[PDB]
Amino acid sequence: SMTLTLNRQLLTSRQILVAFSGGLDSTVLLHQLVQWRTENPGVALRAIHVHHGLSANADAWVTHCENVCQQWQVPLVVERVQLAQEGLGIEAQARQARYQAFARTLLPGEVLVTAQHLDDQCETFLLALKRGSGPAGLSAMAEVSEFAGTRLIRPLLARTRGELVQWARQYDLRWIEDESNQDDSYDRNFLRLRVVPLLQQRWPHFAEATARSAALCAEQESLLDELLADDLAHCQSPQGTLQIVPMLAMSDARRAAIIRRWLAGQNAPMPSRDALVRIWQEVALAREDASPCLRLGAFEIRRYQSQLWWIKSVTGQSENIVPWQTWLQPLELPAGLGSVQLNAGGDIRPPRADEAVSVRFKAPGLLHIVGRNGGRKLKKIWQELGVPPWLRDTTPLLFYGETLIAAAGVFVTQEGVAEGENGVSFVWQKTLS
Amino acid sequence: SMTLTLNRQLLTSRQILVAFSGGLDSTVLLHQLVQWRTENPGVALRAIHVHHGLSANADAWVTHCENVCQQWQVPLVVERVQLAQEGLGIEAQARQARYQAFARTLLPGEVLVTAQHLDDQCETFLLALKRGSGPAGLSAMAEVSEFAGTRLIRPLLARTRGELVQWARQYDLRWIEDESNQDDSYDRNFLRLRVVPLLQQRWPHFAEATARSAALCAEQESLLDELLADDLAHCQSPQGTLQIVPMLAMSDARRAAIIRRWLAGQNAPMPSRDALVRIWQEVALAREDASPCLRLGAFEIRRYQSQLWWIKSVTGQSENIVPWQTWLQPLELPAGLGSVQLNAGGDIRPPRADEAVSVRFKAPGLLHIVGRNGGRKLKKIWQELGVPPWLRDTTPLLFYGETLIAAAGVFVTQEGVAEGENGVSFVWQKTLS
């Protein structure tokens, strides 16, 4: 039935790439896939062993993987990524390097498949538990998730190590397995060896019961997904923000479940239940006048126009002034804001080779712009044009000497309009995400 | 703050009864209550030690409890309930006897209070987990629940054993504590001593994280409570049944959450997620023609009139015939169906001292009843009158010789109508629930 199970989960896939450590689970997953390939002509399969850290057999494991793949006619990428600096041990440092390694060496349209099984579901659950997470975090792992643009499928997720042993053995597969005892100071190890077994003693199927609970938590979260759909549709704008007004009346749990689901949409890192609390109390209910902001890692959620925004944090630049001596060539902007350049053809007057061109993010005094008869301050103009506060000091400002010419993609001052009709275009380019 | 916490949870209470084993938690809870009484004049407090099983100090513990209560001026009920027959050990047999003991010795209007703390929340969670239960069952314990008509409050539910030790010690309270090592074959013991501690090693606050998860599961179930309210109102009749038709269109999770919440309303034992599945697939979607029935312990859920019913199972009696030689005196019915009697005054003709009166639950041939011009079979009459199938063979039928006179509270045959106007009343009495 593991083969039966395999094809159902892999129907929507043609190109697979399996994380292949010499181990049982990988060995059983891979043998099954090579078994699967022989049954579906035209199906391409690739394997990838990730050699990381200074293991005693780190080099031998690689060799073992090269023989098995070849004996089975399967290409094999072998990333040697290395990283460890006294910080977060194996159960963190490496896991990232590995998934990055998977990300790196993964073709487009190819589906990443891992050999994570029941015991891992139990371990994930426990770790979530020891973190005091709710139903969302206790749903542990999904049979199908999104990873590096594509999907990450986990077939053997429901299978027991017993089942895997019974298979790997029935087909006389040879596999490695260095328990690495002394890694007991790294959470996921301390479980499989000490806690979990201790549990399987009086409760032989403990790990099975846990997947059951995980599954039930998931069913409930999806029930809420259904139940909240409308609420979400209404409060979620097309832009990708969340309308505050429609929520002012809701209950704390309602709000949190929505904020939660909304943050998931931006494919954001799962928030802590208290984070969800702060977001509403300190941001949504905060005065827009006082620029509300909750830092959540590299990202930040804030309030603007009675809406909550999930955006990639970026450091201000109001005090910066980046000179453009060679404005004939693009100018690289600070804090990865991208490049900027003056192309022939546009409503902005070119600079004289005698004046000093520069890029800034601030501009004093009353300012006059095209399309408005008046003259207000930068901040007033920003507001009238709807430019969000986090962008009011991160938007390129063209300056010839001490004069403001334009604000990339937002406006052009009147003192900067093309005299004749020729003129140039101040163009702003941002790097890939 | 434990005192602060105490009064908030006990405001809606005047008469308390604390399950008092000599232990820390009880000792700390009780001392705090005697502390609480001194601060709220007119507040009555009672303690109850439950002596059960053949413990080495079973008798000494009692004595210790008698001294402490007296030293503190607190009445003390001491139930000696005993029960153990090789079946379900302490973590089952006794727990029932104890709560029964609590039930028995509890005054009306009095609130039962127990000294269950954080560690118990963790243990309850784990047990639920090892049972593979979902969010509803993983909410573990509530600060306030219903027990024997009244409420069961658990103040110290959030407090750590540490906190309790720090208190019992700060007020120099003396308490007992016989770990009873060899009870390790009884689930809740195997946890507190082996698993939990093993966990608190690498995770000192594991038990605290677990209450956090329990709490979050609860918040979500209440979120659903809110979200499903309307659905429940609509599908739940006034009688206390569940309308099937309005659910036919819903999704599996929706239905289950409703069936679940509905069963809770009848204050029924929490159902297994699969039970919820069977109920719908085997009962709701079953043909009423084929009398659908799912036995869930002493109770059973069934289908009648496009509705699901939660009712106290009762064995049929269609084959039974209980003679009434002394119809002048009440007749005790089988299978705790209650008693039955003929009172002077009613539309039924009395029996002659020459005919043989009896009670039955079946009746052959075409039958003629008052208020209908015709003559159909018992089963047809039952149907036309709306008598549920489980009651069609558990309803007393008056028989003089071989003639049907009446069906208690349902109908009177035409051959049994009072000749003149005097007549008697066939009255059916059922015992307390």
From Swiss-Prot, chains A, B:
Keywords tagged on the record: ATP-binding, Cytoplasm, Ligase, Nucleotide-binding, tRNA processing
Q: Which SMART domains match?
A: TilS_C
The UniProt catalytic activity note for this protein reads: cytidine(34) in tRNA(Ile2) + L-lysine + ATP = lysidine(34) in tRNA(Ile2) + AMP + diphosphate + H(+)
Please provide the Gene Ontology terms (biological process) for this protein: tRNA modification; tRNA wobble base lysidine biosynthesis
Q: Where does ATP bind?
A: S21, G22, G23, L24, D25, S26
- Record's subcellular location: Cytoplasm
Main location as per UniProt: cytoplasm
- SUPFAM superfamilies given for it? Adenine nucleotide alpha hydrolases-like, MesJ substrate recognition domain-like, PheT/TilS domain
Recorded GO cellular component terms are:
cytosol
GO: which molecular function terms? ATP binding; identical protein binding; tRNA(Ile)-lysidine synthase activity
Presence of the UniProt keyword ATP-binding in the record: yes
InterPro entries, sorted: Lysidine-tRNA-synth_C, Rossmann-like_a/b/a_fold, TilS/TtcA_N, tRNA_Ile_lys_synt, tRNA_Ile_lys_synt_N, tRNA_Ile_lys_synt_subst-bd
EC numbers, comma separated: 6.3.4.19
Primary enzyme class:
ligase
Keyword ATP-binding listed? yes
Protein role: Ligates lysine onto the cytidine present at position 34 of the AUA codon-specific tRNA(Ile) that contains the anticodon CAU, in an ATP-dependent manner. Cytidine is converted to lysidine, thus changing the amino acid specificity of the tRNA from methionine to isoleucine. This enzyme is essential for viability.
Q: What family name appears in the similarity comment?
A: Belongs to the tRNA(Ile)-lysidine synthase family.
What does the comment on domains in this protein's record state? The N-terminal region contains the highly conserved SGGXDS motif, predicted to be a P-loop motif involved in ATP binding.
Q: What is the name of this protein? A: tRNA(Ile)-lysidine synthase
Q: What is the lineage of its organism?
A: Bacteria, Pseudomonadati, Pseudomonadota, Gammaproteobacteria, Enterobacterales
Gene designation: tilS
